Design a protein around this ligand. Sequence first.
Ligand SMILES: CC(C)(COP(=O)(O)OP(=O)(O)OC[C@H]1O[C@@H](n2cnc3c(N)ncnc32)[C@H](O)[C@@H]1OP(=O)(O)O)[C@@H](O)C(=O)NCCC(=O)NCCS
Ligand SMILES: CC(C)(COP(=O)(O)OP(=O)(O)OC[C@H]1O[C@@H](n2cnc3c(N)ncnc32)[C@H](O)[C@@H]1OP(=O)(O)O)[C@@H](O)C(=O)NCCC(=O)NCCS
Ligand code: NI
Ligand code: NI
Ligand code: NI
Ligand code: NI
Ligand code: NI
Ligand code: NI
Ligand code: NI
Ligand code: NI
Ligand code: NI
Lengths: 401, 401
Amino acid sequence: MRGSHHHHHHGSMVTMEEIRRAKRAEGLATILAISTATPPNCVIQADYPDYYFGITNSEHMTELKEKFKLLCEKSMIRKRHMCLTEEILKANPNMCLYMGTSLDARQDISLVEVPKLGKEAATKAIKEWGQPKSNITHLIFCTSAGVDMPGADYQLTRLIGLNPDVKRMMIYQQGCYAGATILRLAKDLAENNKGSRVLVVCSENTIPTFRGPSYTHIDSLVGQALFADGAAALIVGADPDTSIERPLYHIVSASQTLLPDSDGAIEGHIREAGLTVHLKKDVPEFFSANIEKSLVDAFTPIGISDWNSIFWIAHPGGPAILDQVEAKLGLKKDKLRASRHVMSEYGNMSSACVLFILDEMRNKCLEEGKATTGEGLDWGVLFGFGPGLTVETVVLHSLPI
Amino acid sequence: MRGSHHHHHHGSMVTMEEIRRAKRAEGLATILAISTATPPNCVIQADYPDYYFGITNSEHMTELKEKFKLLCEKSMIRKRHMCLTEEILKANPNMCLYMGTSLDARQDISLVEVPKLGKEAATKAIKEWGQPKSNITHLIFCTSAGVDMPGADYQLTRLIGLNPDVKRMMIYQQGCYAGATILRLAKDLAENNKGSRVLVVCSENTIPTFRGPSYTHIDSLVGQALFADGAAALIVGADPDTSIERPLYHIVSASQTLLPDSDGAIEGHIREAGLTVHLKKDVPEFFSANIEKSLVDAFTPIGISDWNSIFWIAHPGGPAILDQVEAKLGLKKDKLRASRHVMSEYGNMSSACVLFILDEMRNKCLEEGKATTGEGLDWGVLFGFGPGLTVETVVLHSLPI
Ligand SMILES: CC(C)(COP(=O)(O)OP(=O)(O)OC[C@H]1O[C@@H](n2cnc3c(N)ncnc32)[C@H](O)[C@@H]1OP(=O)(O)O)[C@@H](O)C(=O)NCCC(=O)NCCS
Ligand SMILES: CC(C)(COP(=O)(O)OP(=O)(O)OC[C@H]1O[C@@H](n2cnc3c(N)ncnc32)[C@H](O)[C@@H]1OP(=O)(O)O)[C@@H](O)C(=O)NCCC(=O)NCCS
Ligand code: NI
Ligand code: NI
Ligand code: NI
Ligand code: NI
Ligand code: NI
Ligand code: NI
Ligand code: NI
Ligand code: NI
Ligand code: NI
């Protein structure tokens, strides 16, 4: 009948609307647990130039070694964790060359290691969350350290013992912005599916990227100074039961954009020689020059324009990027503290960094008695940077401690 | 107060709540356009054994060739489209070996071909849709034919000229169920974002899977009899404006599950020799034995138990899979018509198949004057089959013609 409602000519369509109403969640996606893992083996950055040029038979490349020493010194990295050991490299001479035929060997090690390290981080996140693993409805797995069919998502599912009907999304080779990407993904999964609990795992390592030095590619030396191993895990859910679950952050919005005229600035090829990485000298300039446009597009609907009034999580893959953004925007020197703390303690773990940093920030906030998980502030930004060039921008809201 | 006034923005609770209220769409993710593309070069299946054993210099493997002839005759494939030509293969003897070092040569061709073919399909889908491409907010790109950084999603974005702010999700190496996967993905993206319009593109080809014959891997011969090139594109959006947009299918629900005891039944490895594919002989038994459980889980909440009362789209990875599903469930002989039609005309194009089949069904329904896009029926199921073993189950609702 006539009134302030419309009608449907089919009952099945009415049934569809009932289904949709019942299948979806109400609130914003929230982060409920965060955990990290690293391989036990660790290299001290100060000792790495001698170790690296030794193991790659390159002691005679004197100019090159001097450049690498400067790279490791400017890296602002104290230590890095690596599955890759002297023993493993000795058994794989082709990985020690610059472009040796070595993908198969890299793959044979990495494809087992990726979900293994991921499981270690996941188990902890599940333990913090406190709920049975049979309540996890979704899994997001993220890596750039080796592709396989079925993927690391399948391997993790069987390793942990998740429900066979767990809904999986496998995010392969998206590189250093992907830690933000899977937050963008987890937000839509969690908010569109009622009661859904999303396990989010990333796991990165240096197995496919390690290679000997070369005059042909000084940009490769940059990678050898920075890349590191690490895994991180999250439990994400909307509508938390606060009697058993403890929200840490709301995922308010998530954006992604391509930087104009940056085409080709960062490239990564999966080849017979493994994963090759090429970096133009221009990369930090591109990011620092464009980052405010992302801040403005993200925070204008929130009414914020003062970038010192929000808390910051920024992928610290290149120190120059953080340094130039800090200067360009006039950030207070403590804004990127948690970000730089993770880079110093762990190095560039690609997608895992921003999640290490969230954990570091909520931990320090708790033990220093800060008012929020966002260093006492309400609103925050989390950035992923990587190939495209691509900027991922996640707006977060903190929770009271 | 009396004085000059400046402006103030709303506090956290009001701002958080307004964001949450404004963020979501209301209705179900709906498919608004479908388009397909294939490379111009086509091989007739009846001639393929002679062609295949000739180009790989294996004319003396007369026994194997006779087996391959039976595989191609049983394939129920008439023709296949392939970017790979006789001319390309003669210039790449290593691709013609069973396990030749050839990934680099395969990548150099495939990484260009994947977004190119995808672009052809995308352009047509946008044209059917009829809206300016600047209204595309999301892009999902799906391929298993070659990985790169940045990915095919980036390449397609630049080739087409999508907004740099387009939200990209790159789905790599998820194999033959991924056509359903990206429907599952597009559903959550479209439904959780008000006004969002999702371009969904998949592009598959045989460049990394082509290889010479082997007595050790008859399963590889199976692949050489089936795998083919193809791309498909979709526009997906919730809350269509029916004055400018025309709905074809509603994506009602999307599930994913792993088959018990099916470990290793389908594997795909990225190696120095390209993409190797392994298939156990039990694969059709695994799917047909377990498929009814997926039907029950998907359709019980909809009140349906008669599998002939729904329309069917099933990935035609193997004709044996469709044959045993049909037999096991007691399907009428025309249920899988459109599915086997795409297989016959195109072969196994991996993720693209189920989207070709959706296109085939709505085209045939329109030109035969059927009542709905679902062969006159209201509810339908779409199946992806692949590594895991993984069954993706999408429930669809047709639109009236
Ligand atoms: C690596 C890094 C910490 C080095 O610190 P720095 O302040 O650049 O140190 P300097 O510039 O004094 O010295 C670096 C040397 O390596 C060179 N170099 C650095 N990056 C290079 C690149 N991508 N390609 C070629 N050369 C490079 C510099 O030109 C210089 O060479 P030179 O002494 O022969 O002239 C800094 O460049 C950085 O963080 N870069 C970002 C790298 C990046 O894009 N990472 C991925 C982010 S997602
Ligand atoms: C391949 C296929 C078309 C063959 O047709 P068919 O009707 O099964 O023909 P048959 O099974 O009688 O004969 C097939 C021959 O190849 C063999 N064969 C079939 N599939 C095989 C496999 N996966 N691995 C090894 N051998 C296989 C059979 O054993 C038989 O060899 P034999 O004569 O020495 O015993 C059919 O089995 C099929 O469609 N299989 C599914 C393929 C698949 O898994 N696709 C998914 C790819 S991602
Ligand atoms: Ni380089
Ligand atoms: Ni304002
Ligand atoms: Ni610390
Ligand atoms: Ni006043
Ligand atoms: Ni005013
Ligand atoms: Ni005031
Ligand atoms: Ni107001
Ligand atoms: Ni095999
Ligand atoms: Ni046809």
